[PDB]
Amino acid sequence: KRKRSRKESYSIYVYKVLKQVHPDTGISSKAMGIMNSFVNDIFERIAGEASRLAHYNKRSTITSREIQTAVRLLLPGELAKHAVSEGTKAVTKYTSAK
DNA sequence: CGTACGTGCGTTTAAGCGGTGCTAGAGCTGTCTACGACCAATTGAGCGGCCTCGGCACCGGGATTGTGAAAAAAAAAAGCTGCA
Numbered sequence A: 001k002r003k004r005s006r007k008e009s010y011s012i013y014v015y016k017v018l019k020q021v022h023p024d025t026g027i028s029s030k031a032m033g034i035m036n037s038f039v040n041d042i043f044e045r046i047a048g049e050a051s052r053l054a055h056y057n058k059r060s061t062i063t064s065r066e067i068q069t070a071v072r073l074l075l076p077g078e079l080a081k082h083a084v085s086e087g088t089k090a091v092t093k094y095t096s097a098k
Numbered sequence B: 001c002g003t004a005c006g007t008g009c010g011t012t013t014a015a016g017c018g019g020t021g022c023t024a025g026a027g028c029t030g031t032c033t034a035c036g037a038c039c040a041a042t043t044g045a046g047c048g049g050c051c052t053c054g055g056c057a058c059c060g061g062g063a064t065t066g067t068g069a070a071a072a073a074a075a076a077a078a079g080c081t082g083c084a
């Protein structure tokens, strides 16, 4: 009768994104396992590339510029273009919401 | 068995050297504050747990697709000449 320990996952957000993308389409347990393995992976790859960018330039802080550079380094062409576009929107919209 | 490449010639080219002169820009300083750590207190987003019900796995049965043989038609190909 102990409550089971927490296990975070991006799965509520994957669903919310899916419901934008294809409102009438769902996803199996194991397909979610993968979408989660993905998000974590690309997270770890970008954070890691952004870490090294900072570290090379003798920088204490990983800013949104070290992410963007790390995104250009990591992503293929049109993914990178679109990935930067959506990132740069997000920060602009954040700042105008104070 | 055909000609694509390696060899080796003579001719041509610009890489490499060693040097000189100009300056963009790498990299350093010192200054100063906007921003991020840390903090505590506050609170609602996301967790586990639970219950439901519709998608999809599983089924049988018939429709449609794809292969291979067999017999048959078309096919190149094979032993025989003449005529020059």
Ligand SMILES: [Ca+2]
Pocket (backbone or CB within 6 Å): B034
């Ligand atoms: Ca500043």
Ligand SMILES: [Ca+2]
Pocket (backbone or CB within 6 Å): none
């Ligand atoms: Ca749940």
Ligand SMILES: [Ca+2]
Pocket (backbone or CB within 6 Å): B053, B054
């Ligand atoms: Ca349902």
